[PDB]
From a paper:
Phage T5 is a Siphoviridae infecting the Gram-negative host Escherichia coli. In T5, the tail tube is formed by the stack of 40 trimers of the TTP pb616 around the tape measure protein (TMP). Here, we determined the structure of pb6, and show that it results in the duplication/fusion of the hexamerisation domain common to all other tubes. Thus, T5 TTP is not an outlier in the family of TTPs, as it contains the same hexamerisation domain as other phages, T6SS and pyocin tube proteins, but results from a duplication/fusion: the unusual threefold symmetry of the tube is in fact pseudo-hexameric.
The C-terminal domain (residues 375–462) possesses an immunoglobulin-like (Ig-like) fold of the Big-2 family, confirming a previous sequence analysis. For pb6, formation of tubes occurs even when this domain is absent (see below), and some T5-like TTP lack it. The common core shared by both subdomains consists of a β-sandwich flanked by an α-helix, and a long loop. This loop is not resolved in subdomain 1 (loop β3–β4), whereas it is stabilised by crystal contacts in subdomain 2 (loop β13–β14).
Numbering used by the authors:
A (entry chain A): 3 to 38, 67 to 470
B (entry chain B): 7 to 37, 39 to 49, 68 to 437, 441 to 460
Write the structure that this text describes.
């Protein structure tokens, strides 16, 4: 028996001196449970919008995203935890190696009565990717204790969401009923866009609470400790020739999965388009992906299980998130490549030769160069290789040297150094040359 | 929490006939899920259960452990499982129809709540709505929503919950009664053409809504108003997601023919079969709507994500209460599902084949001579074996209401169609 009451939830980093910097209202759904270590749970939606004061992309529950991801104090202008800019609101786990993550106090106003949960830790965020309910997040955690309050700890109307912001938030839902699991083998650069109809992904901190009231002579400086950071997903896809685009894509994906288990993935809630639209993205640069029944095409769709893995034990790079009300294919690609929608990734490389010559005599040298698109790209540097032929070699600085005796076509390849995997090529043919050579 | 919910038609004299335990899935809210509106302006409950059909030990009849909710949703009369309306059953299936729902107030229930050794009850409840889940991974979940007059705490137990409630033997039977086959089929049929299609459903819901309006209480009437609420328009609708392509239906012919029929046909006889249909006895829950409006707008456009299917069941006439009906069983087959669709009961045999006969087996009717035509209807157990008579691809023959056949003036095939509603036909070719 759950009595449904008019409830308002607020989270704070403080117990006194509450203001709009350290406290925020949380727009919880009808499913909200708490009791008594105290345990709590509630849901919200990923609702990205333009903050009026800063003009930056934000979510109305950013303090929860921060507390899930970091042990430091909030700094939206930084590069870790919850952080943002005019292109997107971001979250990363690079600053999560702490016994205790950033502490929150959950204030509950219900039927003119106040209470609060003192000293909370956000253990888990489960994100829904069901096409009919995209971006629902179920938050769960614990608190040291639930305490009734005799009066208002602060003015909820002042501290809470104002009418103007509430209306903006209500129009910020990810409404496009589509999710795409983008999967890329970084060794071959083979990519696939898998439509997702069902499932969830979970960010779990595996927190262990210490049994309180166990008398210690010297106070134990933590009330709990984080466990292994786990970023996983259990999805359902509609995988076949039609859904991927062609029978060759589908056959190539089956071939790839037989020999490749590690991929760079991106789960795009709301899909990706060339015009500015809302989306929430989860990126895992090195994920273990399992699609066992790929060759079985059935009405239940196909199971896709993933486990994001860090590069090193405590790198905190298992994955990261990006949310915006105005994402595009371009800024989603930026997020996937660089970790930020605002940081331009390389999109195209045109290889050029000195004088636009397509031939080169034996023993001569030819300087190659690149025209990298877009010019706003963060890192425009390239690596140089010969991918076809043997009549020339190339320097690390793109100086092509024709062999002194060999002849033939060579394919010069420039590859982006920024993680995009973008390549550009030029064919140069080494020619014999008119030099009057003689037998000595 | 360890909450136990019971529903009853009475406030005293509780027994196993008038009271039953309800196996609620996860809490009963009391604020919730589209309940009643309140007229003459100057409370809501909600919980979920599963459709769990099983054989009752005492009667050997098919039943569900929440039959009193199905009865209260569908009827204003007292419960009578041996009847033909509301919640009713037999050895083949548990059924629900809406033929006895033309009442201001439907059958009242009292919801008793035992939670942490503390009792309370919601006095005088109306079931406004039942929303049934057709998601392949959670088939047959029902979300019930309604209103009551007030929630009242109780100082002592109103009855012994262990005697009134579900016993260990029945509980175990119920726990093995889930519709486990992850498949749903929306069977649609154009009754004019007899063209039928089995559309696989992967998601959605159907809703049975009573549109109840509660009267604002504590309103001074000189003569007491004898109702506290009134039912509105009975609405049976669904919003589904179908897997509709060349391979899902069975062939590209079927898919192309379904697109054709939808462009010119809006009204169909539909059956939503939760759990699928097979030739061996298996559990299933079926919703039938004999006169439904069906809309699949993106049938062509959609290729492989999912196709929206919206339907609205419509009665045959005013106050008929025949918008649709339900049938549940732990042992349904395609044969007894077909009986439910045709006759409203899995136990009532529908016609499956008709062989057209003559006086003997004579085909030599040459000119202006009378010949009595007859039928051999299969199965012999069919309830209604009556047939209508017509002339299909006929040159100069005449047919009456009975089986009499004659061709006048030496001018130079006969078809029997079941009255039953099955649409089964049989023919015979005559010489002339
Ligand atoms: Cl800090
Ligand atoms: Cl972090
Ligand atoms: Cl936390
Ligand atoms: Cl040249
Ligand atoms: Cl030369």
């Amino acid at each position: 028996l759950q009595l449904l009451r008019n409830t308002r939830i607020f989270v704070s980093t403080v117990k006194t001196g509450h203001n709009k910097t350290n406290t925020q209202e949380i727009l919880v759904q009808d499913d909200i449970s708490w009791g008594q270590a105290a345990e709590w749970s509630f849901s919200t939606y990923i609702l990205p919008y333009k903050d009026k004061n800063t003009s930056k992309q934000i979510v109305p529950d950013y303090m929860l995203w921060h507390a899930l991801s970091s042990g430091r104090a909030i700094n939206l202008e930084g590069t870790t935890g919850a952080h943002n800019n005019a292109t997107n609101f971001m979250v990363n786990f690079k600053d999560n190696s702490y016994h205790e993550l950033a502490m929150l106090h959950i204030y509950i106003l219900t039927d003119k009565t106040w209470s609060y949960i003192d000293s909370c830790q956000i253990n888990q965020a489960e994100v829904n990717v069901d096409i009919e309910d995209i971006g629902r997040v179920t938050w769960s955690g614990n608190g040291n204790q639930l305490i009734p309050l005799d009066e208002q700890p602060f003015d909820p109307d002042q501290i809470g969401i104002d009418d103007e912001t509430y209306m903006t938030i209500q129009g910020s839902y990810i409404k496009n009923k589509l999710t795409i699991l983008k999967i890329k083998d970084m060794d071959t650069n083979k990519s696939y866009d898998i439509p997702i109809t069902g499932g969830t992904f979970t960010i779990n901190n595996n927190i262990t609470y210490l049994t309180p009231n166990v008398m210690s002579r010297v106070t134990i400086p933590i009330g709990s400790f984080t466990g292994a950071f786990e970023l996983t997903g259990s999805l359902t896809a509609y995988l076949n020739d039609k859904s991927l685009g062609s029978m060759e894509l589908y056959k190539d994906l089956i071939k790839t999965l037989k020999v490749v288990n590690r991929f760079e993935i991106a789960l795009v809630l709301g899909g990706e388009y060339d015009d500015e639209r809302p989306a929430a993205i989860l990126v895992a640069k090195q994920a273990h992906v399992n699609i066992p029944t790929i060759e079985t095409d059935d009405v239940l769709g196909t199971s896709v299980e993933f486990k994001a893995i860090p590069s090193d034990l405590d790198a905190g790079d298992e994955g990261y998130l990006g949310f915006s009300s105005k994402y595009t294919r371009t800024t989603i690609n930026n997020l996937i490549v660089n970790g930020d929608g605002a940081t331009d990734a390389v999109t195209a490389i045109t290889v050029k030769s000195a004088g636009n010559v397509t031939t080169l005599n034996r023993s001569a040298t030819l300087q190659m160069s690149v025209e990298v698109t877009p010019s706003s790209a963060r890192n425009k540097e390239v690596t140089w290789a010969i991918t076809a032929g043997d009549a020339a070699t190339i320097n690390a600085t793109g100086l092509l040297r024709a062999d002194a005796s060999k002849t033939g076509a060579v394919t010069v390849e420039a590859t982006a150094k920024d993680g995009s995997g973008v390549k550009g090529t030029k064919v140069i043919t080494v020619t014999a040359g008119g030099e009057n050579l003689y037998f000595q």
